[PDB]
């Protein structure tokens, strides 16, 4: 099989590499990710051949001047047909709320809105620098465990630093209690801190929940946003 | 009761007014907008990190609304205007300029200031006019924003609906999201100067299906989709 | 004569059309200015990339001009705007919502627009106004623009001017620009997760000096500061060198 | 003396080690580069301590989320006391009309604000790469020399991939003309090219002349934007 590697953070992430390396034990790797979420339309978008370094296998890859999803539509052409999609490895967690604004499952997405099976993979930071040799049998694990998946599928997988276990999940939802508090900078100007925050703690079963238990997450996604309950309203 | 209006569009947009002045019909208006000059960059909430609102005149042919105007993000102008103009009982964000349709609704600026104030448990409801080509005639569309917030204010709250106006409405329908596969047509490309460039130009497989907000609006309908927070698939969970 | 009206504010920008409404009163008016909703971008006009534009309705509130908003720069709208309208004789840049003083001039988008259509050999000039306080009132500063605009219109072209006018002007004065030294104040802070972070607060050494455009608007007079391209330090062509 | 080296290239640019290594050689060398042109006081700044890069002589380092002035404001903050802020070197071009929003020449002009003395380098780009290694006596020469110059100095710095020369210049300002190409894209919606161009040869003795000459230009700049010969007396009675 052939797998289109890309991500959020750019073509120097180490996260990337460490993702593109795990793929490459399944099949052959290709990877597209952008120079520093819609597919652009407005203009065209650049892209450059990228290097591999003297210590690393070679992967076909490409600098790209554009978003995660136009990194997938332009990983397509220079590398088509491609049977798998894989953003990340993000440096940064994308769970509950957080996967709306996300990149990363962003061009995951548009990999499945091109037909094709797509997961994104995002490690927290939390203090520490991830460690991705630790992580890497977590990555072929959960690789392993995504390939015997119907197809097509997107799968969002957030990994603990250093995960215990491996759970399905679903995504956490949490209503927010605004909070708001004014301040003035060194010049008297006023200006203010947003600090909202979760009014209940993440239920288990959750995707938070479990990555705080030390357990990796994977929640399939749907692409419909459509509330089904509310369409004959009262 | 109290309705907090905002867009992602900015405060001096003709549909920012439009909106505020037709929620004015149903209850007091406050509106919190960004402001000029500023790169669009994200949909969620700045945090830790301080935001710069000022106070700011609504429009001189138009009536008197308290109003902000704030260096920030959509989803900020809900989050401080719940904070200036407390308690808040409604969220309305738009009416963007151009249409937030199908797989556009992920990505909306409109629709996330919405989903913000739900997030925060208010009801809420984004609006979005398809403008391709064509300009909107917000005085000719007031009487169907009317007749779409009066019908939004029966459901039972909180409620959480994406609506698309066509430019001139024929009749109104509750709808779902189109979710259609798509093609990702690249073509290669060489600049004035003689550089390799890619058009993207990603084309839907097939028709929009009946009943959802695409073929709606198409009809010359005003499409009413409520939105759900939750992106699992329960399908695929065991 | 023919006039190219623009700005960096956007095309929604009252300030926009007070200063395309004051300009309709010498000549034939054309606007081209900056859509909304764009990443950050510098001033420099879009080279080997394409750049949409789209005809745009004027406001119903304001005469007619036949305009385009443009998803590019302030000066992409100039160089746009020579090509659609052409001939232009002349580019209004503004009215800005906020102040384009002293070393601002620098970095201002809205002068930068006015800098390109004198780059391309036609008169220019760039307004702006103060704000943090209170918005200004178009309506009472129009006078203003008119008699600053007619004053323009006699000097001998092309000419590159930068104008601010305070909210409630008393005067017109021609001026130098402000040029102060500053202190680079910088404050440390933490934000309310225990992050650190530095407050940047530079300052000026003294008070701007009379006869320099922000000591003029602090007096309430207009100021109109006549602007060189060439940034060429003449005084040291021919550098003595130490030993 | 002390030394504030900078960019608008960001922290990981061969250009910006490049004018850190060659300004060691006159004094200490401090690094502030932006993460990715005024100082920004509408919020704060975030910077970090950030390594220098490996097989490379080591230099305090942070990397500013902020603009090239942010990192001269904040470098003269965490670095004190400064007496020189060097930026560069640029890969690309900062000369005749680029000068004005050359993110490059921000910093150095800040410095200068600030009270110090201040130099811009860039290099032109296209088709080589720029070789370090090669430029370095020509950075060092040129450093030397702006060393001699009576205090504070502000110049404008471009180096050709392989100089054969130093000379000092008058910034490039020639008229361009306009040109608008009309396009549409594959699925025939419209578009416009901008492609303006200069109307003649740049004249002996300016910056653009003296590149292409294959001379380093060295181009002291003034902050006062005034045009004297068009300033007025007041009409009052
Ligand atoms: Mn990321
Ligand atoms: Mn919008
Ligand atoms: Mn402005
Ligand atoms: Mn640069």
């Not at 490459?24 to 597919?39: K, L, M, N, R, Y």
């Not at 977590?138 to 276990?165: A, D, I, M, S």
């Not at 399905?168 to 200006?191: H, K, L, N």
Request: glycine fraction near 8%.
């Amino acid at each position: 099989m052939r797998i289109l590697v890309t991500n959020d953070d750019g073509i120097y992430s180490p996260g990337l590499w460490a993702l593109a390396e795990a793929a490459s034990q399944f099949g052959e790797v290709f990877v597209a990710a952008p120079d520093t979420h819609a597919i652009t339309i407005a203009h065209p978008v650049r892209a450059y051949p990228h290097p591999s370094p003297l210590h690393a296998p070679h992967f076909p890859a490409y600098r790209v001047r554009g978003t995660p999803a136009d990194c997938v539509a332009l990983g397509l052409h220079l590398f088509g047909p491609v049977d798998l999609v894989l953003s990340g490895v993000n440096l940064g967690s994308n769970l509950g709320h957080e996967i709306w604004h996300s990149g990363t499952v962003a061009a995951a997405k548009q990999g499945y809105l091109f037909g094709l099976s797509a997961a994104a993979f995002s490690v927290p930071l939390n203090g520490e620098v991830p460690d991705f040799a630790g992580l890497r049998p977590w990555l072929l694990r959960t690789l392993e465990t995504l390939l015997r998946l119907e197809r097509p599928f997107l799968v969002n997988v957030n990994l603990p630093l250093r995960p215990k276990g491996f759970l399905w999940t679903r995504q956490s939802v949490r209503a927010y209690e605004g909070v708001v508090i004014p301040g003035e900078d060194p010049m008297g100007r006023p200006f203010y801190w947003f600090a909202p925050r979760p009014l209940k703690e993440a239920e288990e079963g959750t995707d938070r929940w479990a990555v705080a238990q030390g357990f990796v997450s994977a929640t399939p996604l749907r692409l419909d946003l459509t509330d089904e309950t509310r369409l004959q309203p009262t």
